[PDB]
Design a protein around this nucleic acid. Structure first.
Ligand SMILES: [Mg+2]
Ligand SMILES: [Mg+2]
Ligand SMILES: [Mg+2]
Ligand SMILES: [Mg+2]
Ligand SMILES: [Mg+2]
Ligand SMILES: [Mg+2]
Ligand SMILES: [Mg+2]
Ligand SMILES: [Mg+2]
Ligand SMILES: [Mg+2]
Ligand SMILES: [Mg+2]
Ligand SMILES: [Mg+2]
Ligand SMILES: [Mg+2]
Ligand SMILES: [Mg+2]
Ligand SMILES: [Mg+2]
Ligand SMILES: [Mg+2]
Ligand SMILES: [Mg+2]
Ligand SMILES: [Mg+2]
Ligand SMILES: [Mg+2]
Ligand SMILES: [Mg+2]
Ligand SMILES: [Mg+2]
Lengths: 26, 46, 97, 41, 214, 124, 202, 141, 178
RNA sequence: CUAAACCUAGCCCCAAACCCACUCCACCUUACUACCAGACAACCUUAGCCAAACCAUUUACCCAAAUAAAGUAUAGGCGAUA
RNA sequence: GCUACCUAAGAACAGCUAAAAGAGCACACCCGUCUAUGUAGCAAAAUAGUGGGAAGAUUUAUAGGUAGAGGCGACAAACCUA
RNA sequence: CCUCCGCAUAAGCCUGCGUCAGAUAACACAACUGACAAUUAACAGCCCAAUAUCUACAAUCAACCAACAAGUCAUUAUUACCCUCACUGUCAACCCAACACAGGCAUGCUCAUAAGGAAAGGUUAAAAAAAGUAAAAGGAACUCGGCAAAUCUUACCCC
């Protein structure tokens, strides 16, 4: 694994964004 | 006429040309062995 | 892909330990310690650099002259090729001539 | 390796984000879009 | 075919011998089944034998907790809480209860109890069960409940939630006496033949006959 | 071409190597007079086999036997218990000296004995 | 065995263990707390208590113990469920399967008090090894255990291939100082007049 | 004995004698059918016939008529996951021709609870009737 | 004659055969000299019997009844060998004063590596023959340079492992408070 | 779906410390092969690429305290360079 | 260990003419004249046919020797592991 | 229906289509994986105690004749000389050519085989294309050239 966690943080924000668009709550 | 068939295997010739006793007898051949355990090969000779 | 899907574990940063609390101490031993010692002999490191700066060439020539007799044959051989390639490089290659 | 870009994923995605409507392999791959994205701009 | 294939395949092994032994919490099967009618000394010994292992033990109050464990264990099947059900139900009773309900939910409500649950007999194990003993109790139960099982897609397999119907069962409980943490848990059912069959299923089915080769 | 990892063996060579190599078998005789081999009983081993009658020992040991702490013998242990009593018997009763040490038993010179000790001739 | 070998539930050599750990697999190691036998105070069969994790606040007897990964096996405590029957057509009968527990997770118990108590590692002046408890001192004896070598030392019968205790312990040795090969010779009564001649060694 | 040096015998010398031999012999069942007298033995590669003859004659006290020697090559074709050659140990074989009329023949060796609760658990199991329709057979209703 | 190569027929077809404990080296010292000489041939006949079952078990593609019955005679026989050689080597040190019962000497081969070259078994002296003179028990001046090379590698291997266990000691010292 | 992801194995530089050899058998004949009459033995400048815009004199590569004197005395198709 | 040449001891060469042959025809065998095919091909030089030699300066197995500032060479500036 | 192939020795590889189970051009022949079995010496390798000494006269059916390239074989006197036949190779559809390669490969017998093999996966029967068969009349007018094919044919030049 390459060092760093800032990129992985903003990626989780992109993951949950896609999960929101895929299966949004009511 | 057709190449690839150069290697005509002969065990008595192999152990005479590239033999343990030959490389140890000649001073030049000694360099082949102790340069090899330096690398760490299992079969130091053939 | 280069990124990682899952996050890494949160690395705990101990800002108060033996090293960081006692960091920077005994650097001014000469200024207010009646100059009994210099701060250059304090640092722990190789013998070819204890309070001294040098480029790639300077550190190499200081190494072989000081500890080169103790260095390995392979490491010493790579050292001679290094300075020889870097001697000609700084002298012949580059701008400003 | 000591210093490596971690957000290469994002700086190309913003390029492809504008180039989603392109046809063929342009919207999918990167370098095909780089030639067309600046030309389209 | 397991031993024969091991011979032909060549996966020879020695007998697995180790100081460790697999400790169980329930005996498989039963010791004596109460043959019901068409509608003793050994019981009192088995009752007071349970008292020798746990002096604070009653019989008159057992049918109460039996029905209490009954309705709450089935309410756990509705909620699908496997953790509570495991401590309340034996390991022999779990697969026969919880296997077929996979890929489907279940609904089970308790209306009332027409007759009171009554102990039928009490049986007990011998000492030659892994140096342990296990007792068993049988209790008849005549109540009225509703049942409505819905499949993966939420359509009723059979039964209706609104109508209850009378039912008779002879529940079997058992408990581990060697340890003290053992508790009474549902084990098996006698399912006698003379009793009538339950309601059929609204759906129709077939069977494939003997596939006759050429 | 040929392999180096495989152990050298008689099988790989020609007729000469197939005959001269040998698979570790020890010598039994010599070969002269038109390849006429000649063994000798003096070189052939002779297994020394005792009688088993009146033999009550058995190969396996019962667990009822108690444990015994390890006491590996040595030169000091053997001499102080076996030959030492002979010393005090002669020291306290008669006279002796370094000469006539064969009375107690000693190895002055090995040549002249059948079973050599260093270099040992026997085996095991 | 290979380096960085993982000791699971089943022992080495078992079919389940070589399946889970073939020769080619190279998984991460485990950084277990180094505990030497000087400080180790947990043997099999002892009564031990648990107070956290799954099924916390109860007590059970140790079934076995493995010294490599510092795991304890308690019977009927911290038990999940698994099937063992054939999965082809039968569903598989359920059974309770035990789980490991770390040495720090588990705490020994006094037999008289039957409560979780700390442990101290002291010597009795009469010897040789003893385990003692915390603030209110009680000498904890060792539990006892059928070793794998002999299942019953007391209920043992001397078979035909087993020698009697008398024949085993009785001694007939004589410090004769004489060579082994020579001692056998006079026992046979055989003769040999030829002497071994000198030979060179280099 | 294997991996042990023997004494040199020159003319007029002592006789070689073994007291604690190290070789171990394998009486085995053969693959091909040999006659009734012939028996097979698998042994290390250092032994020969003359010492194996005195071996069987002395220790086991059986008369031996003759014996042949044979060597077999362990197949080195097997390869581990690292593609390294895996060789089986070679072994010497000896077909002993026994004495006048012993007529030896290899005898047969093997001619003839948790599983208790598991087996009975599978017979008390009831095959799901197709008329049931995959419904759980537990409930009364 | 040959039935002793197999156990009793009562044990044939049995899944677990009875077997006692193995021999202890201490009590083997306690026995006389002719006793263990007889016991060696007893364990020999026994060991051949157990190993006959091993090959026949692998041939029939089945396991043996008692696997640890095999090594019970193996660890008894070497222990018997341990007790024997413990008697003669103590005798050799008492009488002569040597440890190995095979003459040798530290010698430098052509590769410069010092090894305990054990003396071989010969009949004629070393100065008359021609084979032993070809072994060339000495190294040449150019070999000492190569001796330095593997000496460095031996230091590299030590420095790698010693630095490894140091880095190991650091990581759990970080994890565990101790 | 094919795939993707991980965090370890261990490695690199340092400092300190000088370092290695079954003692069951075999292993210089054809190494890993139990056993026979040979007179068979090492001591030698490194060179060249390259730089000098060619190339031919020449072009540091350590051998014994860090620094400083000092890039000084000096050498050199008195040129590069040393 | 291919090939160029050499060294020790060997092997092969049917049959028909001439009945002497570095003779003529022609198998095994050796070489590769000419044509086609193939060209990632069966093949890092082959297949089919037609051809030169085939008792000799012939062909060939086995073992040894000649090693690059060189060797070998019935000089093609050939051959010396594609 | 083919067989210019086959059998075996030497050389070479080393268990490489024997038994059992398994999965994986067709693989259920397995030549793939795991286990079991195996090739038994007379055949052939593995040799000779020393000193001194002898040894002009080919082979070719070896006789006549006939030569030249001048040739492949022998013992003797003395001393010493008790015992004995062990050890090793023995398989295969196999070797060198990156392959199950139309190639390379010595020796004895068979000269069409008592041995060993299968050119076609099935269909339709287009061109172009490769290897052959037959051809009216002409017979090199094609072509740099009778290249190729067919047939069985002469004479003259350069080197
Ligand atoms: Mg090649
Ligand atoms: Mg050749
Ligand atoms: Mg190779
Ligand atoms: Mg043989
Ligand atoms: Mg001819
Ligand atoms: Mg001619
Ligand atoms: Mg001709
Ligand atoms: Mg030529
Ligand atoms: Mg020319
Ligand atoms: Mg030219
Ligand atoms: Mg013969
Ligand atoms: Mg054969
Ligand atoms: Mg050829
Ligand atoms: Mg045929
Ligand atoms: Mg076709
Ligand atoms: Mg025409
Ligand atoms: Mg014309
Ligand atoms: Mg024209
Ligand atoms: Mg024309
Ligand atoms: Mg033509």
């Amino acid at each position: 694994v390459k060092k760093g966690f800032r990129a992985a943080f903003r990626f989780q924000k992109e993951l949950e964004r896609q999960r929101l668009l895929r299966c949004p709550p009511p | 006429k057709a190449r690839g068939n150069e290697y005509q295997p002969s065990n008595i010739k192999r152990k005479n040309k590239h033999g343990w006793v030959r490389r140890l007898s000649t001073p030049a051949g000694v360099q082949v062995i102790l340069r090899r355990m330096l690398k760490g090969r299992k079969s130091l000779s053939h | 892909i280069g990124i990682r899907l899952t996050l890494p574990p949160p690395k705990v940063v101990d800002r108060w330990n033996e090293k960081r609390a006692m960091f920077g101490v005994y650097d001014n031993i000469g200024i207010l310690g009646n100059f009994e010692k210099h701060p250059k002999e304090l640092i722990r490191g190789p013998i070819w650099l204890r309070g001294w700066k040098g480029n790639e060439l300077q550190r190499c020539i200081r190494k072989r002259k000081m500890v080169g007799s103790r260095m390995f044959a392979d490491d010493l051989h790579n050292l001679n090729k290094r300075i020889r390639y870097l001697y000609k490089h700084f002298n012949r290659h580059g701008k400003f001539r | 390796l000591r210093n490596r870009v971690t957000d290469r994923y994002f700086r190309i995605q913003e390029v492809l984000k504008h180039a989603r409507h392109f046809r063929g392999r342009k919207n999918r791959c990167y370098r095909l879009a780089v030639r067309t994205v600046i030309r389209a701009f | 075919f397991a031993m024969q294939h091991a011979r032909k395949a060549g996966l020879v092994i020695p007998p697995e011998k180790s100081d460790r032994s697999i400790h169980l919490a329930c005996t498989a099967g039963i010791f004596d089944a109460y043959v019901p009618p068409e509608g003793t000394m050994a019981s009192q010994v088995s009752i007071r034998r349970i008292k020798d292992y746990d002096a604070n033990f009653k019989i008159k109050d057992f049918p109460e907790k039996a029905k209490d464990i009954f309705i709450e264990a089935h309410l756990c099947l509705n909620n699908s809480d496997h953790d509570r059900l495991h401590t309340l139900v034996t390991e022999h009773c779990f697969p026969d209860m919880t296997w077929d309900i996979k890929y489907k939910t279940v609904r089970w409500s308790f209306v009332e109890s027409l007759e009171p649950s009554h102990v039928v007999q009490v049986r007990c194990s011998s000492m030659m069960n892994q140096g342990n003993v296990y007792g068993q109790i049988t209790v008849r139960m005549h109540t009225r409940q509703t049942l409505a099982i819905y499949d993966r897609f939420g359509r009723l397999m059979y039964g209706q939630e609104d109508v209850p119907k009378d039912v008779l069962e002879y529940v079997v409980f058992e408990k581990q006496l060697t340890n003290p943490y053992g508790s009474w848990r549902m084990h098996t059912k006698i399912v006698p033949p003379w009793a009538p069959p339950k309601q059929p299923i609204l759906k129709t089915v077939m069977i494939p006959g003997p596939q006759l080769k050429p | 071409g040929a392999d180096r990892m495989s152990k050298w063996t008689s099988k790989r060579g020609p007729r000469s190597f197939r005959g001269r190599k040998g698979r570790g078998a020890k010598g039994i005789g010599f070969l002269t007079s038109g390849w006429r081999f000649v063994q000798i009983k003096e070189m052939v081993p002779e297994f020394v086999v005792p009688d088993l009658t009146g033999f009550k020992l058995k190969p396996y040991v019962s667990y009822l036997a108690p444990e015994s702490e390890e006491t590996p013998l040595t030169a000091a242990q053997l001499f102080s218990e076996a030959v030492a009593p002979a010393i005090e018997k002669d020291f306290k009763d008669g006279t002796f000296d370094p000469d006539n040490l064969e009375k107690y038993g000693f190895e002055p010179t090995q040549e002249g004995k059948l079973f050599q000790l260093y270099p040992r001739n026997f085996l095991r | 065995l290979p380096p960085h070998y993982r000791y699971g539930m089943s022992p080495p050599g078992s079919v389940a263990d070589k399946r889970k750990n073939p020769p080619w697999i190279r998984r991460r190691p485990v950084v277990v707390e180094p505990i030497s036998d000087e400080d180790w105070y947990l043997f099999c069969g002892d009564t031990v208590e648990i107070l956290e994790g799954k099924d916390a606040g109860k007590q059970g007897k140790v079934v076995q113990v493995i010294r490599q990964r510092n795991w304890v096996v308690v019977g009927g405590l911290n038990t999940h469920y698994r099937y063992i029957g054939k999965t082809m057509d039968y569903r598989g009968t359920m059974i309770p399967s035990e789980a490991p527990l770390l040495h720090r997770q588990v705490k020994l118990v006094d037999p008289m008090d039957r409560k979780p108590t700390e442990i101290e590692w002291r010597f009795t002046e009469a010897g040789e090894r003893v385990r003692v408890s915390t603030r209110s001192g009680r000498i904890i004896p060792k539990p006892e255990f059928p070793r794998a070598d002999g299942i019953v030392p007391e209920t043992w019968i001397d078979g035909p291939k087993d020698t009697s205790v008398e024949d085993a312990l009785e001694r007939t040795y004589v410090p004769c100082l004489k060579t082994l090969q020579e001692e056998v010779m006079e026992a046979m009564g055989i003769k040999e007049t030829r002497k071994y001649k000198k030979v060179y060694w280099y | 004995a294997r991996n042990v040096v023997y004494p040199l015998y020159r003319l007029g010398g002592p006789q070689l004698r073994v007291f604690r031999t190290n070789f171990f012999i394998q009486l085995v069942r053969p693959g091909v059918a040999q006659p009734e007298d012939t028996v097979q033995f698998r042994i290390p590669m250092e032994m020969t016939r003359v010492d194996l003859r005195n071996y069987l004659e002395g220790i086991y006290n059986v008369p031996v008529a003759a014996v042949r020697t044979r060597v077999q090559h362990g197949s080195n074709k097997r390869r581990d996951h690292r593609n390294v050659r895996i060789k089986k140990p070679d072994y010497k074989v000896a077909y002993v021709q026994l004495a006048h009329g012993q007529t030896f023949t290899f005898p047969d060796l093997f001619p003839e609870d948790l599983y208790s609760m598991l087996e009975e658990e599978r017979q008390q199991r009831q095959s799901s009737d197709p008329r049931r329709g995959g419904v759980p057979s537990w409930f009364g209703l | 004659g040959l039935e002793e190569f197999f156990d009793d027929p009562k044990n044939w077809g049995q899944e677990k055969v009875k077997s006692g404990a193995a021999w202890t080296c201490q009590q083997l010292r306690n026995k006389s000299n002719e006793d263990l000489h007889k016991l060696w041939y007893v364990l020999l006949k026994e060991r051949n019997m157990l190993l006959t079952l091993e090959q026949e078990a692998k041939r029939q593609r089945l396991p043996m009844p008692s696997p640890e019955r095999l090594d019970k005679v193996v660890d008894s026989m070497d222990a018997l060998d341990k007790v024997v050689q413990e008697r003669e080597d103590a005798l050799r040190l008492l009488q002569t004063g040597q440890e190995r019962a095979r003459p040798g000497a530290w010698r430098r081969d052509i590769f410069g590596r010092i090894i305990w070259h054990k003396f071989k078994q010969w009949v004629i002296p070393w100065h008359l023959n021609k084979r032993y003179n070809r072994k060339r028990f000495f190294a040449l001046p150019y070999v000492d340079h190569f001796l330095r090379l593997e000496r460095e590698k031996r230091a590299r291997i030590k420095a790698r492992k010693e630095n490894l266990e140091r880095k190991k000691a650091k990581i759990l010292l970080k994890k565990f408070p101790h």
